[PDB]
């Protein structure tokens with residue numbers, strides 16, 4: 048029995064990694080992820096210059112998940128590049144970096160810096176097209192013309208295989224249009240589905256007040272709220288983008304949800320809210336739980352059921 | 360103390376009504392809603408000719424809500440017009456009709472028939488711009504150019520105050536764009552936020568199969584999944600559309616959620632999944648619970664706290 052995943056010319060011990068933004072901002076964060084049982088890890092979505100992000104409170108834990116408006120707090124691209132170039136232990140696991148420049152110009156400058164590091168070390172890029180908590184910046188993934196520009200310029204500047212973190216879509220026509228754009232860019236080798244359900248609003252009945260400070264209380268929703276949306280997006284892109292991998296993100300708290308993501312088409316499974324709650328010990332637990340389910344089903348490898356969800 | 364809502368010249372005993380699609384397809388259904396403690400009721404979203412809808416199974420109750428791909432099963436516009444003109448007891452409560460033509464031309468034909476009945480009986484129109492379960496038809500509300508055509512043509516053909524049932528939005532830019540369209544049509548007097556979270560996917564880990572037959576398992580999500588999205592949309596349009604009422608729909612299981620919708624800016628509060636689960640007796644419970652909360656906080660009327668959510 049094996050949880051191994053072989054993608055992007057790399058071997059992964061298991062399909063699990065952190066979702067970007069969770070346990071991946073500081074060197075301590077990245078060390079802890081690297082020391083974890085996780086199959087991989089990804090750095091915080093970064094910008095050219097550092098950011099401290101939005102004012103507090105900017106995160107609120109909920110019964111059914113989380114709401115956040117972090118605002119892309121990050122140590123700046125130079126920090127993540129230096130981690131990838133000289134700190135990270137690649138013998139432990141592969142490393143992804145999320146890049147989230149707030150303009151095509153910023154992104155282009157950033158991805159150009161990664162090229163030598165990718166060539167030397169094998170560091171993988173995930174382009175963030177779904178930043179929902181920066182005031183005045185729309186989610187790029189909801190604008191297909193802007194998305195096309197980013198993919199074009201990054202394809203030219205970076206010129207190596209990379210992935211995209213997509214916002215959740217809720218309409219068949221949008222699946223179609225998103226896939227049509229993604230399928231024009233052969234360097235896009237994986238799609239991460241999905242980012243937070245953007246711009247939700249939580250109000251505390253007791254004090255009649257929103258629970259987070261930025262953007263009048265509007266923030267991205269994670270956790271149990273997003274599982275059906277995540278599964279749909281994973282499966283939709285899995286079918287529409289056969290020449291690309293899909294990474295599953297959203298609602299993973301146990302082996303059962305991981306199993307569902309993989310059945311829907313996920314190669315890798317990312318863990319956000321649950322990891323924030325439980326810390327890196329979750330990855331040991333997820334490995335155990337997924338193996339239990341596989342044992343019960345009489346499956347030896349992930350390839351026995353990846354993308355094999357049955358319809359009626 | 361008073362749960363009363365006074366809008367469009369009508370007195371509503373309370374703000375509660377069924378969401379379109381739940382307990383409102385047949386005469387029996389409509390009778391039970393009229394006999395219930397609800398402040399109002401809305402007829403099933405209808406088409407010019409009858410529809411039987413999607414194949415079974417097309418509805419699945421979930422721990423956290425519901426998934427459905429009903430496909431607009433309805434008795435045709437003549438049935439609902441006839442109910443509105445001949446059968447409905449207006450002394451019990453006002454009646455809304457939802458109209459969901461699958462083309463602007465179909466919509467125009469339908470609303471023209473309603474004009475004489477609205478003038479004589481006071482029947483209120485809700486235009487469905489968010490049907491997510493018709494194979495091959497995108498949700499109109501996600502196309503601002505198409506939405507503009509529907510509102511133009513319906514405004515001209517109907518010529519009387521009406522409302523729109525909007526899909527949920529997840530980006531600030533979409534709130535802005537949607538509002539910019541709605542604010543160009545003075546006859547649009549209310550906005551219902553929100554329809555189902557479209558095109559989610561539920562898989563049963565036990566049999567590795569989707570739980571609904573149509574569209575490879577993809578259906579609209581309702582219930583606890585949609586509360587924060589609903590509150591966000593209600594609040595976003597409450598602030599952006601001062602010349603219009605906002606009706607809340609999504610995640611209402613109790614007086615507490617109803618209170619939150621109203622605090623966010625809702626005039627009327629619609630109940631879908633919870634009503635399907637519990638039956639029309641729910642309205643008696645919702646009235647009681649909302650009254651208790653208002654008593655506890657010292658509010659004598661909904662007007663004292665409608666749209667008065669506090670931010671930091």
Ligand SMILES: Cc1cc2nc3c(=O)[nH]c(=O)nc-3n(C[C@H](O)[C@H](O)[C@H](O)COP(=O)(O)O)c2cc1C
Pocket residue numbers: 066067068069091092106113115117119145175177212241242243268269270271273296297298299317318319320321323
């Ligand atoms: C505190 C926090 C910070 C996040 N930061 C990022 C980020 O920097 N980049 C990104 O692409 N997604 C970010 N996300 C979204 C997650 O990567 C993930 O898509 C989302 O939380 C859904 O997964 P979950 O249900 O496991 O939480 C963040 C989420 C949280 C809760």
Ligand SMILES: Cc1cc2nc3c(=O)[nH]c(=O)nc-3n(C[C@H](O)[C@H](O)[C@H](O)COP(=O)(O)O)c2cc1C
Pocket residue numbers: 378379380381403404418425427429431457487489524553554555580581582583585608609610611629630631632633635
């Ligand atoms: C079985 C079912 C049928 C529905 N039919 C319609 C419909 O015909 N027209 C419509 O505008 N919305 C329809 N909806 C959406 C609901 O009106 C409502 O917006 C959604 O369920 C979210 O509210 P909830 O969280 O209370 O379920 C339907 C939902 C369900 C569950």
Ligand SMILES: O=C(O)/C=C/C(=O)O
Pocket residue numbers: 068092115116117118119120175177178179180181242243267
């Ligand atoms: O840092 C945040 O605000 C979230 C980023 C994201 O979801 O991409």
Ligand SMILES: O=C(O)/C=C/C(=O)O
Pocket residue numbers: 380404427428429430431432487489490491492493554555579
């Ligand atoms: O009848 C349905 O499938 C759904 C209707 C709606 O969501 O508007």
